[PDB]
Amino acid sequence: SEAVKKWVNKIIEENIIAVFAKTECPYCIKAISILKGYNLNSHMHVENIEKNPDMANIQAYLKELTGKSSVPRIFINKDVVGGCDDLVKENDEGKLKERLQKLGLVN
Ligand SMILES: [Ba+2]
Ligand SMILES: [Ba+2]
Ligand SMILES: [Ba+2]
Ligand SMILES: [Ba+2]
């Protein structure tokens, strides 16, 4: 149990933009595309947690951290963004750009 948590943590802490996704997931794809549209590829990690023997443990931990077990699950500098709909709200209302500017990721 500790092992799974430590592995998830490492992904979130070693990558400024961390996205947990699954196979053939339209809102995963959309969210990742939005983020790459800010040229964040170099600070981005996408983990497919469906292709993983411990998917349920990972999803349960992501729910403990964020309130939902669904993918996509999106972290920016360890802060919880949430899912694709959360990302879209932040993007449309200017908060996403604000976040990225404070990190030096967008001018
Ligand atoms: Ba399918
Ligand atoms: Ba990368
Ligand atoms: Ba298993
Ligand atoms: Ba199992």
| Closest ligand by atom to 26 CA | 1
Strand partners, 47: 20
CATH number at residue 63: 3.40.30.10
Two structure tokens written together for 67: 């309130």
- DSSP letter (8 states) at residue 79: E
Backbone angles phi, psi at 58, to 5 degrees: -65, -45
Number of structural domains in the chain: 1
Domain that holds residue 2: 1-103
Ligand 3 center from residue 49 Cα (angstroms): 12
Ligand 3 center from residue 54 Cα (angstroms): 5
Does 50 count as an annotated binding residue? yes
Beginning with the edge strand found earlier in the chain, give each strand of the sheet holding 79-82 in spatial order. 44-48, 17-21, 73-76, 79-82
- The Cα 19–Cα 3 span in angstroms is 19
The torsion region of residue 62 among left (phi > 0), alpha (psi -120 to 50) and beta comes to alpha
Ligand 3 center from residue 19 Cα (angstroms): 22
SS3 61: helix
Does 41 count as an annotated binding residue? no
Exposed, middle or buried by CB within 10 Å (0-12, 13-18, 19+), for 7?
A: middle
Two structure tokens written together for 90: 């932040």
